[PDB]
Write an enzyme that holds these catalytic residues in place. Structure first.
Site, PDB file in Angstrom:
ATOM      1  N   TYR A 130     -62.830  -3.418 -35.286  1.00  0.00           N
ATOM      2  CA  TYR A 130     -62.436  -2.036 -34.961  1.00  0.00           C
ATOM      3  C   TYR A 130     -61.501  -1.438 -36.012  1.00  0.00           C
ATOM      4  O   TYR A 130     -61.676  -0.297 -36.415  1.00  0.00           O
ATOM      5  CB  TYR A 130     -61.720  -2.056 -33.616  1.00  0.00           C
ATOM      6  CG  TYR A 130     -61.265  -0.729 -33.034  1.00  0.00           C
ATOM      7  CD1 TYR A 130     -62.146   0.078 -32.288  1.00  0.00           C
ATOM      8  CD2 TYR A 130     -59.943  -0.319 -33.159  1.00  0.00           C
ATOM      9  CE1 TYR A 130     -61.706   1.273 -31.700  1.00  0.00           C
ATOM     10  CE2 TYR A 130     -59.486   0.881 -32.564  1.00  0.00           C
ATOM     11  CZ  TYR A 130     -60.380   1.662 -31.852  1.00  0.00           C
ATOM     12  OH  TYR A 130     -59.915   2.811 -31.248  1.00  0.00           O
ATOM     13  N   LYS A 161     -62.796   1.762 -38.136  1.00  0.00           N
ATOM     14  CA  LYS A 161     -62.019   3.004 -37.963  1.00  0.00           C
ATOM     15  C   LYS A 161     -61.393   3.479 -39.289  1.00  0.00           C
ATOM     16  O   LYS A 161     -61.365   4.699 -39.578  1.00  0.00           O
ATOM     17  CB  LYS A 161     -60.951   2.843 -36.863  1.00  0.00           C
ATOM     18  CG  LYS A 161     -61.528   2.786 -35.408  1.00  0.00           C
ATOM     19  CD  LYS A 161     -62.102   4.181 -35.016  1.00  0.00           C
ATOM     20  CE  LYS A 161     -62.340   4.253 -33.510  1.00  0.00           C
ATOM     21  NZ  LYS A 161     -62.749   5.624 -33.055  1.00  0.00           N
ATOM     22  N   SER A 186     -58.467   6.483 -34.924  1.00  0.00           N
ATOM     23  CA  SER A 186     -57.458   5.709 -34.172  1.00  0.00           C
ATOM     24  C   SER A 186     -56.247   5.485 -35.026  1.00  0.00           C
ATOM     25  O   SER A 186     -56.352   5.439 -36.251  1.00  0.00           O
ATOM     26  CB  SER A 186     -57.983   4.323 -33.748  1.00  0.00           C
ATOM     27  OG  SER A 186     -56.920   3.580 -33.173  1.00  0.00           O
TER      28      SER A 186
HETATM   29  N1  LIG Z   1     -58.259   5.039 -25.295  1.00  0.00           N
HETATM   30  C1  LIG Z   1     -57.438   4.880 -26.346  1.00  0.00           C
HETATM   31  O1  LIG Z   1     -56.165   4.340 -26.215  1.00  0.00           O
HETATM   32  C2  LIG Z   1     -57.855   5.247 -27.733  1.00  0.00           C
HETATM   33  C3  LIG Z   1     -59.174   5.587 -27.964  1.00  0.00           C
HETATM   34  N2  LIG Z   1     -59.559   5.911 -29.236  1.00  0.00           N
HETATM   35  C4  LIG Z   1     -60.948   6.285 -29.503  1.00  0.00           C
HETATM   36  O2  LIG Z   1     -61.347   7.299 -28.599  1.00  0.00           O
HETATM   37  C5  LIG Z   1     -62.749   7.251 -28.453  1.00  0.00           C
HETATM   38  C6  LIG Z   1     -63.066   7.398 -26.970  1.00  0.00           C
HETATM   39  O3  LIG Z   1     -62.533   6.263 -26.344  1.00  0.00           O
HETATM   40  P1  LIG Z   1     -62.121   6.167 -24.809  1.00  0.00           P
HETATM   41  O4  LIG Z   1     -62.207   7.520 -24.222  1.00  0.00           O
HETATM   42  O5  LIG Z   1     -60.879   5.380 -24.725  1.00  0.00           O
HETATM   43  O6  LIG Z   1     -63.357   5.299 -24.259  1.00  0.00           O
HETATM   44  P2  LIG Z   1     -64.236   5.352 -22.916  1.00  0.00           P
HETATM   45  O7  LIG Z   1     -64.915   4.046 -22.830  1.00  0.00           O
HETATM   46  O8  LIG Z   1     -63.381   5.705 -21.758  1.00  0.00           O
HETATM   47  O9  LIG Z   1     -65.296   6.510 -23.244  1.00  0.00           O
HETATM   48  C7  LIG Z   1     -66.302   6.249 -24.201  1.00  0.00           C
HETATM   49  C8  LIG Z   1     -67.411   7.301 -24.043  1.00  0.00           C
HETATM   50  O10 LIG Z   1     -68.349   7.105 -25.086  1.00  0.00           O
HETATM   51  C9  LIG Z   1     -69.623   6.782 -24.554  1.00  0.00           C
HETATM   52  N3  LIG Z   1     -70.267   5.821 -25.447  1.00  0.00           N
HETATM   53  C10 LIG Z   1     -69.863   4.540 -25.769  1.00  0.00           C
HETATM   54  N4  LIG Z   1     -70.765   4.028 -26.612  1.00  0.00           N
HETATM   55  C11 LIG Z   1     -71.714   4.973 -26.864  1.00  0.00           C
HETATM   56  C12 LIG Z   1     -72.859   4.993 -27.638  1.00  0.00           C
HETATM   57  N5  LIG Z   1     -73.239   3.942 -28.370  1.00  0.00           N
HETATM   58  N6  LIG Z   1     -73.629   6.138 -27.674  1.00  0.00           N
HETATM   59  C13 LIG Z   1     -73.293   7.247 -26.940  1.00  0.00           C
HETATM   60  N7  LIG Z   1     -72.167   7.222 -26.159  1.00  0.00           N
HETATM   61  C14 LIG Z   1     -71.399   6.100 -26.133  1.00  0.00           C
HETATM   62  C15 LIG Z   1     -69.355   6.253 -23.157  1.00  0.00           C
HETATM   63  O11 LIG Z   1     -70.408   6.451 -22.235  1.00  0.00           O
HETATM   64  P3  LIG Z   1     -71.665   5.437 -22.134  1.00  0.00           P
HETATM   65  O12 LIG Z   1     -71.140   4.030 -22.021  1.00  0.00           O
HETATM   66  O13 LIG Z   1     -72.349   5.821 -20.855  1.00  0.00           O
HETATM   67  O14 LIG Z   1     -72.475   5.560 -23.401  1.00  0.00           O
HETATM   68  C16 LIG Z   1     -68.184   7.139 -22.752  1.00  0.00           C
HETATM   69  O15 LIG Z   1     -68.653   8.406 -22.316  1.00  0.00           O
HETATM   70  C17 LIG Z   1     -63.227   5.945 -29.059  1.00  0.00           C
HETATM   71  O16 LIG Z   1     -63.794   6.214 -30.341  1.00  0.00           O
HETATM   72  C18 LIG Z   1     -61.939   5.166 -29.243  1.00  0.00           C
HETATM   73  O17 LIG Z   1     -62.043   4.266 -30.334  1.00  0.00           O
HETATM   74  C19 LIG Z   1     -58.650   5.935 -30.285  1.00  0.00           C
HETATM   75  C20 LIG Z   1     -57.318   5.583 -30.082  1.00  0.00           C
HETATM   76  C21 LIG Z   1     -56.924   5.237 -28.784  1.00  0.00           C
HETATM   77  O1  LIG Z   2     -60.240   1.443 -28.301  1.00  0.00           O
HETATM   78  C1  LIG Z   2     -59.324   1.508 -27.505  1.00  0.00           C
HETATM   79  C2  LIG Z   2     -59.642   1.587 -26.032  1.00  0.00           C
HETATM   80  O2  LIG Z   2     -59.216   0.383 -25.385  1.00  0.00           O
HETATM   81  C3  LIG Z   2     -57.893   1.505 -27.983  1.00  0.00           C
HETATM   82  O3  LIG Z   2     -57.086   0.815 -27.017  1.00  0.00           O
HETATM   83  C4  LIG Z   2     -57.780   0.825 -29.358  1.00  0.00           C
HETATM   84  O4  LIG Z   2     -57.399  -0.544 -29.226  1.00  0.00           O
HETATM   85  C5  LIG Z   2     -56.794   1.498 -30.299  1.00  0.00           C
HETATM   86  O5  LIG Z   2     -57.406   2.672 -30.820  1.00  0.00           O
HETATM   87  C6  LIG Z   2     -55.462   1.831 -29.638  1.00  0.00           C
HETATM   88  O6  LIG Z   2     -54.815   2.834 -30.414  1.00  0.00           O
END
Ligand SMILES: NC(=O)C1=CN([C@@H]2O[C@H](COP(=O)(O)OP(=O)(O)OC[C@H]3O[C@@H](n4cnc5c(N)ncnc54)[C@H](OP(=O)(O)O)[C@@H]3O)[C@@H](O)[C@H]2O)C=CC1
Ligand SMILES: O=C(CO)[C@@H](O)[C@H](O)[C@@H](O)CO
Ligand SMILES: NC(=O)C1=CN([C@@H]2O[C@H](COP(=O)(O)OP(=O)(O)OC[C@H]3O[C@@H](n4cnc5c(N)ncnc54)[C@H](OP(=O)(O)O)[C@@H]3O)[C@@H](O)[C@H]2O)C=CC1
Ligand SMILES: NC(=O)C1=CN([C@@H]2O[C@H](COP(=O)(O)OP(=O)(O)OC[C@H]3O[C@@H](n4cnc5c(N)ncnc54)[C@H](OP(=O)(O)O)[C@@H]3O)[C@@H](O)[C@H]2O)C=CC1
Ligand SMILES: NC(=O)C1=CN([C@@H]2O[C@H](COP(=O)(O)OP(=O)(O)OC[C@H]3O[C@@H](n4cnc5c(N)ncnc54)[C@H](OP(=O)(O)O)[C@@H]3O)[C@@H](O)[C@H]2O)C=CC1
Ligand SMILES: O=C(CO)[C@@H](O)[C@H](O)[C@@H](O)CO
Ligand SMILES: O=C(CO)[C@@H](O)[C@H](O)[C@@H](O)CO
Ligand SMILES: O=C(CO)[C@@H](O)[C@H](O)[C@@H](O)CO
Ligand SMILES: O=C(CO)[C@@H](O)[C@H](O)[C@@H](O)CO
Ligand SMILES: OC[C@@]1(O)OC[C@H](O)[C@@H](O)[C@@H]1O
Ligand SMILES: OC[C@@]1(O)OC[C@H](O)[C@@H](O)[C@@H]1O
Ligand SMILES: OC[C@@]1(O)OC[C@H](O)[C@@H](O)[C@@H]1O
Ligand SMILES: OC[C@@]1(O)OC[C@H](O)[C@@H](O)[C@@H]1O
Lengths: 263, 263, 263, 263
Positions: free
Chosen positions: C157, C161, C144
């Site tokens: 977080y 991260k 992130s």
């Molecule tokens: N969205 C954003 O603005 C940003 C996101 N990120 C990172 O991107 C990654 C994906 O996030 P995002 O797509 O936004 O999140 P979502 O919640 O939309 O997707 C998360 C996915 O991970 C799965 N998951 C969560 N916990 C577990 C677990 N313990 N074991 C196996 N699967 C798991 C969920 O399915 P299920 O619950 O069914 O397990 C789901 O498929 C994260 O690491 C986040 O920190 C980084 C920067 C920005």
């Molecule tokens: O984890 C998520 C999903 O909400 C992000 O919003 C984080 O706050 C951060 O990685 C945004 O860059």
């Protein structure tokens, strides 16, 4: 804490006012003799008079433009003639910028390159030999938080301060063999006269609350929610050039009240 | 330079030996009351006796494992009951690692997470309220150059020191409102007992030239071509926790003899 | 541009929705066989069906919690059983936090450590041997922008991260031996379902202008003044894992619309 | 993966040999029209013919010195006359340095400032308006790993590459409003003609094993233990300027085989 700099000779560029004068006062308080460098003769005289009166150290005034090789040569010759050489050099002369890249003239880019970078290059070439002969020394470059975290309004300053921060690092590796320790300090918001002038200009048409303007600047940029005083910044310069900071080599130290947003 | 530390209460974790002990001595010299924390009480007794006898300061010994919530809890209660609260906290308890990611047990990862990160989390939670009530304070996290420039042989230490560096920055923004200033110091090569032990161990079957081994380490990593003494490093901790460093918030300060290869 | 990944086996953790699903779609489009990993069984099955029917690749579901050693073990064994081993691994499963350091329970720190860091540690130990035997591979850690530029509301977080970003780097130097290339991607604002849900929750009592709330977040943080789509982010993951990015080793790549405020 | 740059106009400075030539070939392979820029007419004429012949795109030759205002103006005018404007600009023209700070002449500092920094300033001023009118664009600055991790032998190059990296960031925030995306690439060891020439020069009197010399350079600096090919590197330039990299803004992307020692 004993700083161990009593009787050492410290050259501070841009030291007739603002941060540089507070730095000079910091070193003088620890017993260091001072070489003041700036353009205006009047401020230089007052700064020297005040330092000698308050602290009883020797003070030399050099009234030159350090953005020119002639000006740097004059600093070097003045140091040589009065003191033989310098033990400490602080590159501090500088000023902010204000332009867009699309509009700024090439000459403006050149001006800041000569002032912020080439002054430090030329002063190192000119004073390192004397420092080496005295058994070593300390050199600090006052760059800015903008050297890594650019402020939108001053791209020329950002670029040239970034260059200066790299110059500090390259010089540090080159002269450590001479027992000369080179570091960079990157200040955040420090309350100096141009900030007050700017605050007045920017509030001229909306009520003149210049202190309110400054407070909003601090609220936006700094978790500490205030500007630093030059004196509080100057402490770090004095520490870094002292016998207590003998393992600081090629580092960049931010003094910024939390303004840097990254690690 | 006046540090304004006299009569302040400083808690230094891992202060029976090495860097933490040198930091405690640095604070004692400036008149601070000292809380020494380590597991092995023989070294705590010896350290506390020396500080009291050389510097005339009050010293409280807390013999506990700071990698445990119970140990931290005891530190907090010892401080509250003896002093009311802390003015200064230095997170220093730690040790290097030595493994590959492919071979290391999960339990080893957990050990370093508890020791290097959760100790600092739990000490902040525990001590910040008392510090707030006293009007502010200073917290330093002693991470390492490895928190940004990882050493090949200690991936767990690198990861957990990196986490510690980020923790420091996050805590800095949370508590600055309370006039509590949090910063990180990242040392390079510091000559401590364990380096000398390792040197002797790695040279036992090839000449026992342990001084030669240490010099090769310095030649490899540091432009200054020596280790620092704990005492020279300790100066920086004392300065950052002093009345002279009041604008340092959420910063990371390297003290590394040039070892950091980047800006 | 040919990516050279047809027929390669890509394991994507957290790929039943959001960014992980978009990355799986990106790989599937380039002809990779896919291992999808998430906790909710039906959501994962339906994501798998959609990939398999839209892109004609093989898709293996592993419905487990990757924050547990037992879940990781199941992934490794499912990969071994169906495909022999993996060519590509993307560590993506994760979620944001929301707390202060002063209030958060130790158990919350532990949860994020297991989910964001230990999952990557355990998957590397489990999958690297198969990747080695296949002649090399690519591993990406989706960390992130917060790994370097912490967001005020989520200290746990940010710390974990940051730890993951360092883990990526340490793993990179350990396995490049085996022609396995490890890198980290640091995304900025990516429009995923939880962002939309949060916008709807935070606007329920002031007019329900959820799009307005998201636009204000973008205006505050990103020079580009919009969120990215998961699909636009996914391109970078596919490219980094391709035959076209064979000199990328131990790097961190920000994909953030200008959000990183520093160099 | 479709790059979506067929029929776009790409200006690549210093593209008659080495990295710049490889980038031109990479864009040509994707259907982009090419503006080739270098000083030596014969090499440039040859490279242009070869490109046109091999890829069937339009190729415009501009044989000028981009370290001068006159050279930049000639690029801008030729692009205007032949194509109307540019969609893509890659600032690549440059060369290494070799000096000490204590010995280098002011004119050498100026030479690198003009070549590496002012070229990009002047080309941005000249080409951004045409790019804006075409609906947006991409600009890449090819800086170097030395922009953050200085190499001991070339301080002038390190300082001016650092300045260029900051320039890239400042330009990115200024022009994103025009849908122009600006990024920096920082390559590690790339096998180009001057490395071979240097390896031969340095092995002239010790056996002539210039390939062995290059291997030792890679062994010393890069975990991957080899140089990159210019074609390997060029993929990253093409990707960053494509319709697949639309959320990359003001980023610096290292392509360095593990050479960067820090996060
Ligand atoms: N969205 C954003 O603005 C940003 C996101 N990120 C990172 O991107 C990654 C994906 O996030 P995002 O797509 O936004 O999140 P979502 O919640 O939309 O997707 C998360 C996915 O991970 C799965 N998951 C969560 N916990 C577990 C677990 N313990 N074991 C196996 N699967 C798991 C969920 O399915 P299920 O619950 O069914 O397990 C789901 O498929 C994260 O690491 C986040 O920190 C980084 C920067 C920005
Ligand atoms: O984890 C998520 C999903 O909400 C992000 O919003 C984080 O706050 C951060 O990685 C945004 O860059
Ligand atoms: N104030 C702030 O918020 C911050 C300042 N800085 C840096 O601190 C440094 C000093 O700034 P600050 O104290 O605010 O500025 P001031 O304008 O208050 O002081 C600048 C000093 O430099 C001198 N000076 C300027 N140009 C030259 C020149 N060409 N030759 C010789 N002397 C010169 C001035 O005297 P005279 O005009 O007589 O020559 C004056 O003594 C600068 O490098 C600035 O970039 C960094 C971060 C923050
Ligand atoms: N020495 C160096 O080159 C560098 C050191 N550092 C950091 O400096 C810090 C101090 O290390 P250094 O002085 O080298 O090491 P020492 O081994 O000399 O000192 C470590 C101190 O920490 C204590 N300690 C260790 N574990 C615990 C624990 N669980 N609970 C309470 N106290 C503990 C030790 O005492 P006891 O065993 O009795 O508990 C001892 O007092 C460490 O965090 C280290 O990572 C950073 C960069 C470089
Ligand atoms: N090779 C490497 O390991 C690395 C290189 N880089 C950077 O890559 C870029 C390309 O270098 P590389 O391919 O190695 O070098 P080359 O010398 O092989 O190619 C340089 C190209 O730029 C042209 N050029 C040089 N100066 C000018 C000028 N003033 N005006 C117009 N064209 C000019 C040259 O042609 P001509 O002489 O005829 O003008 C030539 O076509 C440089 O910016 C370099 O700093 C960055 C990291 C590593
Ligand atoms: O360095 C900074 C702010 O920290 C710039 O905004 C200014 O130019 C500074 O010199 C104050 O005028
Ligand atoms: O040396 C420093 C100051 O801590 C730098 O490393 C900054 O963090 C930044 O320029 C890059 O990390
Ligand atoms: O931080 C360092 C040295 O820079 C670690 O590698 C060591 O483990 C140190 O803690 C003491 O050995
Ligand atoms: O950037 C580098 C190597 O990383 C420099 O050493 C040189 O200038 C290279 O461009 C030429 O060999
Ligand atoms: O800022 C509060 C304080 O207690 O913080 C710790 C410093 O040592 C002390 O001088 C200072 O007054
Ligand atoms: O339809 C999706 C899928 O995961 O469903 C379960 C099947 O066993 C598997 O082959 C298939 O790819
Ligand atoms: O480098 C090994 C490899 O499997 O790594 C993953 C890439 O997708 C693939 O193209 C490549 O051949
Ligand atoms: O963004 C600037 C930079 O050097 O900051 C540090 C990171 O390693 C890298 O991703 C990044 O390019």
């Amino acid at each position: 804490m004993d700083m161990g700099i009593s009787g050492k000779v410290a050259v501070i560029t841009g030291s007739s006012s603002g941060i540089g004068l507070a730095i000079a006062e910091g070193f003088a308080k620890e017993g260091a003799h001072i070489v003041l460098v700036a353009r205006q003769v009047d401020r230089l005289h007052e700064a020297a008079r005040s330092l000698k009166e308050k602290f009883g150290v020797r003070v030399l005034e050099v009234a030159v433009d350090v953005a020119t090789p002639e000006g740097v040569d004059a600093v070097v010759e003045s140091v040589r003639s009065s003191f033989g050489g310098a033990d400490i050099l602080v590159n501090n002369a500088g000023t902010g910028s204000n332009e867009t890249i699309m509009e700024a003239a090439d000459e403006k880019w050149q001006f800041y390159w000569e002032l912020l970078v080439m002054a430090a290059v030329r002063l190192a070439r000119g004073l390192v030999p004397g420092m080496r002969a005295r058994g070593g020394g300390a050199i600090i470059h006052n760059a800015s938080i903008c050297a890594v975290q650019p402020l939108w309004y001053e791209p020329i300053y950002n670029v040239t301060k970034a260059a200066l921060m790299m110059f500090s690092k390259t010089l540090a590796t080159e002269v450590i063999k001479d027992n000369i320790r080179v570091n960079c300090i990157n200040p955040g918001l420090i309350l100096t006269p141009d900030w007050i002038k700017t605050a007045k200009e920017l509030t001229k048409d909306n009520g003149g609350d210049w202190k309110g303007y400054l407070q909003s600047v601090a609220d936006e940029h700094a978790p500490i929610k205030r500007f630093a005083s030059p004196e509080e910044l100057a402490n770090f310069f004095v520490f870094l050039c002292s016998e207590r900071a003998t393992y600081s080599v090629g580092s960049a130290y931010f003094v910024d009240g939390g303004m840097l947003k990254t690690l």
